[model samples]
Target: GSPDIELVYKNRGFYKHYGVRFGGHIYHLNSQDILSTAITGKSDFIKEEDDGKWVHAMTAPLDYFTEKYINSGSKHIFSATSNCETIARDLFPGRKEITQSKALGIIGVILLSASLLSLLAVPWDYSSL
Candidate 1:
């Protein structure tokens, strides 16, 4: 089945900004309004204005999105435009964890390479010795 809601651009900085489509309308949330709902854990509903003034948009947290909508079974899951979860997984699986040993090994290799290069830069004069 096709997804009723589609997640567009998801950005992170001072506040998370996301674009989503639902009920045939494309909504975009700016950083200002996102901070309010993110801090209070509440959803904001926007309404049409007669004076032409409008807020950025509305958004929900990650867990809120899944709990209230994804698990509801009424809508399908999609990342950008595809309904395949694999595509979404490939795009953003999660942050990768690095171990301390791995970091130390990388530093060691860099130091060794730098030492080798420095040694190779000077010409050895064995005749003076």
Candidate 2:
């Protein structure tokens, strides 16, 4: 369910280079040069000894890790994988107007229409206004 995800890394005005995409949706994660030796050590690497087992590898934001590597001016962007409908429902629910507020609104509209119509008809000499 993963669409093509491309991670573009940018640095200071000193360097102007971009990473190349490998295949499908994969890119050179190391080419970003964002990770340090100490942080990279925690990354899950499969060895010959490990067989048919899935190792969970996770990388957190560099700023959250250390201050020396922190570029306060820069922003970190992560890709979100989700369905379109899921995102929509999360922001806005469909049954928003089925509550007491809607009922009150409807009643108010009906009352206003009735009052306006009655007031207008009064000028027609039905009540001789």
Candidate 3:
């Protein structure tokens, strides 16, 4: 990520996807677009012919900004996690820990579900149980 990169603005649309533009690009950054590029390090989200054409455009993962500049709380890896914690904290800044706990609970549920599904794939004889 470039040091020049900064969160210039954000707009929460009424019935549209949220907007975030960092560099000089006229188009706002789409969450899904930024997500794929940062995580996969590929421009698959962009049109094949238009990929890499935006020389001034750049994207960074959530953790990048959190770990680099934000010292408020734990860094978030996904949008859901970040939004969960952020909204909670904003609603009750005095109970920041509560937000963290809620975020952890959400993460735990996801992990636990995945673990259970993995167990379902194990071959076994039900009669042996």
Candidate 4:
């Protein structure tokens, strides 16, 4: 059977919560909207895919040191650039990024623009799991 790593997301009111599943482990990087630190760990509590609330955003064959990146620990953040999506991108080498849909995209784009004006607030829930 063919296989690949998975990048998944969950709606969290104003932002999406993100995670990557590989080697049967789901790892997540979390950070706040603004003025907060980041955390990284394997998430065993969430089964959003089973609940069908979580959506798969990207897929890729595992890259070198991907697990290392996943376990690389958290990052300090005062800006949105270091949020979950960025972290996910940094972790996986080739998986593309995903935003929302038509109606949702409008809202997200507006929020994204506002965030840029507000200093690039990442469109993901940066809080703890």
- Using TM-score as the measure, the top candidate is 4
lDDT of 4 by residue, 38-75 (tens): 22211122212244445565565443224423333232
Minimal lDDT window, size 10, model 3: 42-51
* Clashing pairs in model 3, backbone N/Cα/C closer than 3 A: none
> What Cα-based lDDT does every candidate model obtain?
0.29, 0.24, 0.29, 0.36
lDDT of 2 by residue, 21-124 (tens): 21222111222222331233221111122222211122223222223222212222212223121322221235454443332222222212222233334322
Give lDDT for model 3.
0.29
Off by over 4 Å in 4: 21-49, 64-129
Question: For model 3, what is the alpha-carbon lDDT of residue 36?
Answer: 37
Tens digits of per-residue lDDT, candidate 1, 1-107, equal: 22333333222323223344443343332225433433543232221112322223323343433443334211111112122212222222342343333322222
For model 2, give the 10-residue run with minimal summed lDDT.
42-51
Q: What lDDT score is found at residue 125 in candidate 1?
A: 20
Point out the higher-scoring one by TM-score: 2 or 3. 3
What CA RMSD would you report for each candidate? 22.8, 30.2, 18.0, 13.8
- Tens digits of per-residue lDDT for model 3, 1-129: 323222222211211111123223222222343333245432211101222223221244434433433433323333342333343343224554655555333332222222223233322221111
- Residue 55 CA displacement from its true place in model 4, Å: 1.2
By lDDT, the best candidate is 4
